[PDB]
Amino acid sequence: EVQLQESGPSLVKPSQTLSLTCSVTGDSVTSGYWSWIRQFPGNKLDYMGYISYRGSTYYNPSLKSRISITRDTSKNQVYLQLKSVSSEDTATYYCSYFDSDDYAMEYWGQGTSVTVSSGGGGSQIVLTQSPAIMSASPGEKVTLTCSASSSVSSSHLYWYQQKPGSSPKLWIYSTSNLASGVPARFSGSGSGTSYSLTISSMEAEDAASYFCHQWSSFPFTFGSGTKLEIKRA
Numbered sequence: 766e767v768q769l770q771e772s773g774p775s776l777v778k779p780s781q782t783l784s785l786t787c788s789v790t791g792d793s794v795t796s797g798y799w800s801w802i803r804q805f806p807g808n809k810l811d812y813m814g815y816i817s818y819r820g821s822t823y824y825n826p827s828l829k830s831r832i833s834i835t836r837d838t839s840k841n842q843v844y845l846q847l848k849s850v851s852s853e854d855t856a857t858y859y860c861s862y863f864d865s866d867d868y869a870m871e872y873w874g875q876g877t878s879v880t881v882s883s884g885g886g887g888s889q890i891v892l893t894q895s896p897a898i899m900s901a902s903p904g905e906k907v908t909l910t911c912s913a914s915s916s917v918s919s920s921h922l923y924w925y926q927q928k929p930g931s932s933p934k935l936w937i938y939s940t941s942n943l944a945s946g947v948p949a950r951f952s953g954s955g956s957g958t959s960y961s962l963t964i965s966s967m968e969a970e971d972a973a974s975y976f977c978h979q980w981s982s983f984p985f986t987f988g989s990g991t992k993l994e995i996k997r998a
């Protein structure tokens with residue numbers, strides 16, 4: 766019902782300005798937010814900011830002065846402008862749509878890679894995921910954990926699954942609710958600063974990366990992730 770597609774240069778010189786476009790297609794919308802999220806090499810996800818249905822914007826303090834998110838409703842597009850880029854801005858950029866009236870769904874674009882040839886100040890909740898890599902035999906009960914540096918509302922603790930060459934997919938919302946498309950063998954639990962995702966019985970198709978995410982406090986943050994691999998070569 767809602768598809769997003771990012772576009773723009775794949776290479777930019779330092780000090781130059783980065784400009785990306787997100788073309789939105791699908792059914793009409795009566796609310797919601799369009800966010801820009803980037804993933805650095807190593808797979809760390811970074812929440813950049815958003816522009817709402819009413820043009821209200823929020824920018825991650827670490828980008829505040831360099832970023833601008835705008836909209837051109839007549840042509841159903843959202844834009845991202847990041848000034849004075851450096852090698853630290855090399856990453857895959859994704860635009861995403863979310864309707865706070867419906868926590869169970871989130872849509873992500875295909876993402877577009879950008880390689881480069883802190884006025885703000887604030888605070889953020891750090892999400893730790895250990896171990897970073899994990900191997901399990903099919904049939905094993907698997908448990909992945911996520912520890913927040915500060916408390917977060919369980920209603921705002923989400924989990925995403927990502928496989929190489931694909932954008933993150935909403936997996937669990939509000940700590941223990943499975944998203945559409947997720948096998949019931951998955952479950953989640955937790956509260957305060959301690960959360961977990963469990964697979965009753967590891968299946969081959971479950972090998973992928975899993976990231977926890979919190980949008981209880983601004984700026985929203987993502988965990989470093991846990992790469993789950995299967996055993997037996």
Ligand SMILES: CN[C@@H](C)Cc1ccccc1
Pocket residue numbers: 798800815863865871923980985
């Ligand atoms: C669940 N993922 C959040 C980034 C969706 C969102 C976007 C904008 C405002 C609030 C919430």
